DNA sequence: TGAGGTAGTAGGTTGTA
DNA sequence: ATACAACCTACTACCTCG
């Protein structure tokens, strides 16, 4: 067996408490609340200081050395309190705040390769280092020819206990940006009309779109009324422009929307917004080769913070403190516990299932209500292929026949389905209009002989003729007619190969058509802890003032998929209404009791979203109808990657393991070996309960087991995971009955 | 959209100290 | 009575799957 880590660094030696000087601040300018000014006086007196340090106390500020009074600022008038050795104990916080202060003074000076500085630094958590490392250890540069810079964006957030030890909290990412801007783009004369772009002098809200060049010249009177080099100097920022030659005042001026207004820049102001697309798009070669760096196994991830943590070296103004290089033996020292969790037992039509991938030789747990008929919109010059890509997943949905060869691996009739050559319908269509899509969507359903649609679309890839998949999928979704749809490629790839990989994309694609006619795969043989049902809900906050409804759902015992629910009236805002939450319970309540004779005695809410709803309600509500319940809240993106250690060896964790603290615990939920990154494992802290967080991380990752929709985990759990997809597909909504038949699996 | 895993990139909002 | 750090959302790209 093996230990488990986060990834964190001890620090040896210890802080001493040190001499801190207070300073008080107070709003001269318009802003007389400091606290809404705090951070400005702060950062201009940091700023104007050597890059002394200047600390944030809950409305005061400290340097940890003497910084004279300084009164011209116009809105702060910083001023001298108390020389007060502070005490550790009282403040984590401002210690945690020194620690970090001085790993970004230590590793400001710190040069690679003699001239090149390695890590660029602004004194805050993150912490920018312009080398990489490869696989083989080598701090090297990763640029193109292009001139797109990879670059580690390192994480640190220390803390420090109540005695002084301190604690090193570390994560590392990848970074783009590229030395190139989009004056280096005109320089270099190449496309750039719309194109995402990041102001790095002007800091705007909501996401910048190119719209156009205009040939004016940036050194004239402007539409704004005077000239935008003007404009800089008014903003103090002639130490860069005063660097502008002949040939950059003749550059022109480049607008770009601002979601509010487009704004009237110089092109040398903007770097485009680095997004891989804009790699694939502008250097695939490149993006291939570091895509092995960008994902990072636990091994590639040590080596990388080791790097780091060696050039923090020894830092002596916290009296010789210096981080060890390795991580922990258990997070038992930290403060969290291990464990990894047993496996769920699966089972399927003739009982248990042994792989996750022979279901096919065993066929599906329930099947829907009888009887279902194929149907498929095709391109009209891409015909035989899809005619003998349709053969094929029907031969194995049917005959259970692999391209013409029958094979034990398959059972006959795994759905009860009718498909016909001679009987059914395809109706075909053009690559072209969206119009043309819906109408032929239209003309399928003009026929009511269809009883479920495998459409064939147009790539995700291909920005030439228009993508087919979203008309057909609302038209299709307004029928409440399943459709399993299909990518050309796909086509494609039946059509050629007589291969296994046609074995892999038909696995799928099958468990997606019996997940769409509401027919569920396999399930857990049972469940870890005295649970009847599941409940999920999610609430997505998807852009400046949005505020979405939850959308829930229900599972059993066995956590196959009963019933899920769109909620009657609006919220208030995105805080809920307590009767939605009512309106959705009743649904739940009424939807287990007509499904299997009798009230749940056992509901696990596990909530994502926040904490809007009170937990008072819930308190209230299961106590007068008297049934105990636990509110597990899911958190779905975390940082906190976990690695494996076997005796010094750092790789990626199997799934199912775990590590906890209380009321908040993570656990990796998928395998990925090597070569591929380190999972990113679950956020779960329960809200309210009775129960264990060993029974819930089991339950958890035993509904990660039963994604049916794939062969393979889905990272959340069905719960969680079919609450977020549901809420990605608000427009998808059942239109009468709130059943089954899972638009979006 | 196989399909969902990691991975980035922008971006908005709170929950807890 | 207000923080700032996690979450969370949106789009892609890579890459594997008896
Ligand atoms: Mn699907």
């Given at each position: ?84 050795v502070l005490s550790i104990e009282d403040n984590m916080s401002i210690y945690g705040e ?348 003009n026929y009511n002989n269809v009883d479920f649609v495998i459409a064939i679309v147009p ?287």
């Open positions: 067996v093996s230990n488990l880590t986060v990834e964190a660094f001890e620090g040896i030696g210890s802080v001493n408490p040190m001499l801190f000087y207070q300073y008080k601040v107070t709003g001269k300018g318009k802003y007389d609340n400091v606290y809404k000014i705090i951070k400005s006086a702060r950062y201009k007196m940091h700023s104007k200081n050597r890059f002394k340090p200047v600390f944030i106390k809950d409305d005061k500020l400290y340097t940890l050395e003497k910084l004279p009074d300084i009164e011209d600022l116009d809105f702060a008038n910083i001023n001298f309190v108390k020389s007060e020194v620690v970090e202060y001085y790993i970004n003074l230590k590793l400001k000076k710190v040069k690679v390769l003699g001239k090149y500085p390695k890590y660029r630094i602004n004194y805050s958590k993150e912490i920018l280092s312009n080398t990489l490392l490869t696989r083989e250890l080598k701090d090297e540069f990763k640029k193109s020819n292009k001139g797109f810079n990879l670059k580690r964006k390192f994480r640190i957030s220390p803390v420090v206990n109540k005695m002084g030890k301190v604690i090193l909290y570390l994560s590392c990412s990848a970074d783009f940006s590229t030395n190139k801007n989009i004056y280096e783009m005109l320089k270099e004369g190449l496309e750039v009309e719309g194109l995402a772009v990041k102001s790095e002098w002007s800091n705007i809200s909501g996401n910048l779109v190119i719209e156009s060049v205009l040939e004016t010249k940036i050194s004239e009177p402007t539409s704004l009324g005077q000239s935008l080099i003007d404009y800089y100097k008014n903003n103090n920022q002639g130490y860069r422009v005063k660097d502008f030659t002949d040939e950059d005042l003749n550059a022109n001026i480049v607008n770009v929307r601002g979601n509010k207004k487009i704004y009237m820049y110089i092109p040398h102001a903007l770097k485009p917004i680095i997004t891989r697309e804009y790699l694939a798009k502008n250097d695939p070669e490149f993006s291939k080769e570091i895509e092995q760096l960008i994902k990072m196994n636990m091994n590639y991830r040590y080596e990388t913070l080791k790097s780091f943590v060696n050039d923090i070296g020894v830092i002596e103004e916290l009296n010789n403190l210096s981080f060890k290089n390795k991580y922990y033996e258990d997070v038992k020292l930290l403060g969290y516990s291990s464990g990894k969790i047993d496996e769920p037992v699966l089972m399927g039509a003739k009982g248990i299932i042994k792989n996750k991938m022979q279901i096919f030789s065993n066929g599906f747990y329930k099947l829907p209500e009888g009887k279902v008929r194929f149907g498929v919109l095709y391109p009209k010059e891409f015909d035989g292929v899809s005619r003998k890509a349709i053969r094929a997943i029907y031969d194995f949905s049917k005959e259970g026949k692999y391209h013409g060869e029958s094979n034990k691996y398959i059972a006959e009739h795994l759905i009860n389905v009718e498909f016909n050559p001679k009987e059914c319908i395809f109706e075909g269509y053009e690559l072209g209009d969206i119009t043309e899509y819906k109408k032929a969507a239209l003309k399928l359903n790539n995700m890839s291909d920005e030439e003729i228009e993508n087919s998949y979203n008309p057909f999928k609302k038209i299709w979704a307004e029928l409440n007619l399943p459709s399993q749809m299909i990518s050309v490629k796909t086509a494609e790839i039946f059509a050629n190969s007589r291969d296994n990989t046609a074995l892999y994309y038909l696995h799928n694609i099958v468990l997606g058509i019996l997940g769409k006619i509401g027919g569920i795969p396999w399930v857990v043989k049972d469940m870890k802890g005295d649970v009847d049902c599941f409940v999920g809900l999610d609430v997505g906050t998807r852009e400046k003032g949005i505020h979405y409804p939850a959308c829930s759902v229900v599972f059993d015992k066995y956590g196959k998929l009963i019933n899920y629910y769109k909620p009657n009236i609006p919220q208030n805002g995105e805080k809920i209404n307590t009767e939605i939450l009512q309106e959705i319970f009743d649904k739940v309540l009424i939807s287990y009791e007509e499904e299997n004779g009798a009230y749940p005695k056992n509901i696990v809410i596990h909530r994502a979203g926040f904490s809007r709803e009170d937990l008072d309600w819930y308190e209230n509500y299961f106590g007068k109808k008297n049934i105990k319940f636990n509110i597990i809240e899911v958190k779905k993106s975390t940082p906190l990657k976990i690695a494996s250690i076997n005796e010094g060896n750092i790789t990626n964790p199997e799934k199912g393991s775990y590590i906890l603290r209380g009321n908040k615990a993570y656990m990796v939920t998928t395998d990925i070996k090597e070569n591929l990154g380190s999972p990113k494992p679950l956020k779960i802290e329960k809200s309210y309960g009775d129960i264990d967080m060993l029974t819930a991380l089991s339950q958890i990752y035993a509904l990660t087991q039963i994604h049916v929709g794939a062969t393979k985990s889905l990272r959340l759990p069905i719960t969680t995971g079919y609450a977020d997809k549901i809420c990605k597909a608000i427009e998808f909504i059942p239109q009468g009955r709130v059943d089954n038949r899972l638009f979006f699996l």
